[PDB]
Design a protein around this ligand. Structure first.
Ligand code: MG
Lengths: 39, 68, 108
């Protein structure tokens, strides 16, 4: 004859924490983001 | 005995080609020599200075040791 | 004159020396005239984790008539390596040429 599922808990966790409010958490985020984008 | 006779006998025929002097003029007319191998050198005196070519530099390994 | 080039070692001081020879030497003597010094180091390291690879090379010939002085230095600076980035390296080279009394100008 003739769709991406996301996680509620992990999304809430990663939205809860903020970078960018100071240089310390910003630099931690930068270092992790560099290595994570690489590998 | 046979070999050193036949090789010289063939050399007599093969060396006796026609003209035989225009190619002397053709070879000697290029008094600029064959192009010689390039090296990095100093401008004033031409002593060689070290190169960083990748196909040679990729084999090199060094280490660090304490001094006495 | 082979007894002049047999000497005690000293073993190690950091630098290396080679003698430098000319194409036409004197008739009844040895042809070597100058000395080339070579040094190589890695200064700003913490505990063998280095910073700034560095090396230097100087050729010197001094007598009462002429003076030859050539020199070269290289400094390498590494910005990133994987997985912290891509491999990103810069290099600075300097060189100088002095040849008295033939030229009376120096080359940089
Ligand atoms: Mg020299």
């Amino acid at each position: 004859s003739k769709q991406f599922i996301y996680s509620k808990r992990w999304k809430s966790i990663f939205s809860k924490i903020q970078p960018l409010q100071n240089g310390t958490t910003r630099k931690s985020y930068q270092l992790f983001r560099n290595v994570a984008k690489q590998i | 005995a046979v070999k050193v006779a036949l090789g010289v006998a063939f050399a007599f025929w093969w060396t006796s080609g026609p003209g035989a002097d225009e190619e002397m003029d053709a070879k000697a007319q290029q008094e600029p020599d064959r192009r010689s191998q390039y090296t990095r050198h100093y401008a004033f005196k031409g002593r060689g200075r070290k190169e960083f070519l990748r196909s040679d530099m990729k084999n090199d390994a060094n280490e660090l040791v304490p001094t006495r | 004159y082979s007894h002049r080039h047999a000497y005690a070692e000293a073993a190690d001081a950091g630098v290396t020396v080679i003698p430098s020879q000319d194409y036409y030497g004197p008739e009844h003597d040895d042809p070597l005239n100058g000395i080339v010094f070579q040094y190589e180091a890695q200064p700003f390291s913490r505990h063998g984790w280095g910073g700034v690879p560095f090396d230097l090379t100087v050729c010197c010939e001094k007598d009462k008539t002429s003076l030859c002085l050539q020199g070269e230095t290289h400094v390498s600076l590494v910005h990133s390596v994987p997985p912290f980035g891509p491999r990103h390296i810069t290099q600075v080279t300097g060189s100088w040429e002095v040849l008295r009394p033939n030229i009376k100008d120096v080359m940089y």
